[PDB]
Design goal:
By secondary structure, the chain is α+β, with helices and mostly antiparallel strands. It contains 19 helices and 21 strands. The chain has a domain of 248 residues: Nucleotidyltransferase, domain 5. The protein is 45% helix and 17% strand. The strands form 7 sheets. Strands 4-7-6-5-8-9 form a 6-stranded mixed sheet, with helices on both faces. The chain has a 4-stranded antiparallel sheet with strand order 19-20-16-21. The structure holds magnesium ion.
Length: 577
Amino acid sequence: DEITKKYIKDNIINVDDNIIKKKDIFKLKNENNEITECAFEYFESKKKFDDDIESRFFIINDNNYNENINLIYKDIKYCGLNIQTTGLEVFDENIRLIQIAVENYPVIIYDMFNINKKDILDGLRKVLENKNIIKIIQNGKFDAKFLLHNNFKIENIFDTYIASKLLDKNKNMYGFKLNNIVEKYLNVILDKQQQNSVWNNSLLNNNQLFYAARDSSCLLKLYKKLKEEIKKENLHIVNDIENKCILPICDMELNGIKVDLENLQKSTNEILNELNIEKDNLKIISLRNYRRLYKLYSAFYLKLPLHINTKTNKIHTTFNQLKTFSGRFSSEKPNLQQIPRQKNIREIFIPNDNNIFIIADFKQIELKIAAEITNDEIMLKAYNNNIDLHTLTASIITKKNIPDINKEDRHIAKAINFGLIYGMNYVNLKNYANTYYGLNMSLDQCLYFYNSFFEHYKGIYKWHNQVKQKRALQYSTLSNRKVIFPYFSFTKALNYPVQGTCADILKLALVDLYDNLKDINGKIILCVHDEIIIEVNKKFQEEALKILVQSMENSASYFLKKVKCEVSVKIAENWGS
Ligand SMILES: [Mg+2]
């Protein structure tokens, strides 16, 4: 009986001689009622850990499997969920271990590479599906993608990453790895060296298992303290929304979006002919033509093929829900917000055969949010009367009546609104209009615009002055998502509550959507700026349309109480429409 080969029957390699197998009796309660006790075999460390985190564990093999283990799940309310995988990309990797930590019990470790009987996993699958049991997870998007891809259904998550990230209020970019969070909230130092280990082999190291186990045990204590701190800072609503938003996000990343390679290769050759022809003719008109076609070609039409899945013609971007200052979503590899906002281009993004796109956008949601949080009477009443805010401003500036307002007046009004709402003076207003709107506006005119604007929009005036006076650094949204600035900045101060509230609305809408989109097996594809794209079988065209609008209007209703939003919708076969 060699040391190393001591536990091959359990797929363990005793490297350090730091492990013992033991068989002891535990205090359970039968499936019927009577408090039954059961004998279990578990592994414990020889050298006692300096910490109080559970370091013993059960291991589940196709070999030794005691159904009584599942009785530990009976009548739990929360558990610590963790998994160890072969790599990072789900489509190309496999789940190695599924660890579940239950209070006052050694960690249950499902050895996936040595399990072929479905019966075993029945216990696990039950837990994961139980809407009434909270699964504590560190970085839940990752683990949830893997499980959902391996057809494990999961619901009710509490993400310690989300909790820690929110509690930080966006004043640090790093320090949200598990060991960091533990050293902060529990003042315990975990061994992170076993992250770099190999989990692809069919035999597991002696120390890798202890690492895995502990990395789940701590989720219980961590959950308690983080729950407490979240409640203290009044972040329950935000934290809850984000946790519930994990699953929708996974839906977007797993579904992906399909590309029509015909318009792609064709358009590539076309812009190639334009770049060559313009290079011949050329070698201000010339510069802008060449640079534009050069970027659209090389900085888009040439990069996109790299992200296509060679087999599915699908792009599976990665969404981030808390790597932004405002709180909005952000995508990468590829960054969907950097795709040209042009019909000719976006028309290459299509639904699947028997499916179709439904696309919904918010209209002037930012200006409405401003009206709400400001409680600006004129804006709120005009909105309730279904009068456009640009028209409203035009009326105030020109002193004309709506029947006498013309397109040029509305254009000037757009400049005045988008400029002055977020805190420009008349000089910056002149430059802003003259630049983005092409208006040869004089300084005297712009000064009139300023005075008139804040003469009538007295709520807005109060908002600006109060901010400018207090010069605070702490700011919140309507979900009470908080942030702390490094230094005071007027424009950013005014901008955060608006953009952050938009992020809250969109995210909650995705949650409601993901819930109400199951009866028709609908898929959520994309969320960009203030628009959402879902994909449904052409059968449920009208039904899905109603569902989408319902989710977005309901979400806006949750946060805004004296303004009503407007959701424009289109049923399209292309992103460009
Ligand atoms: Mg983990």
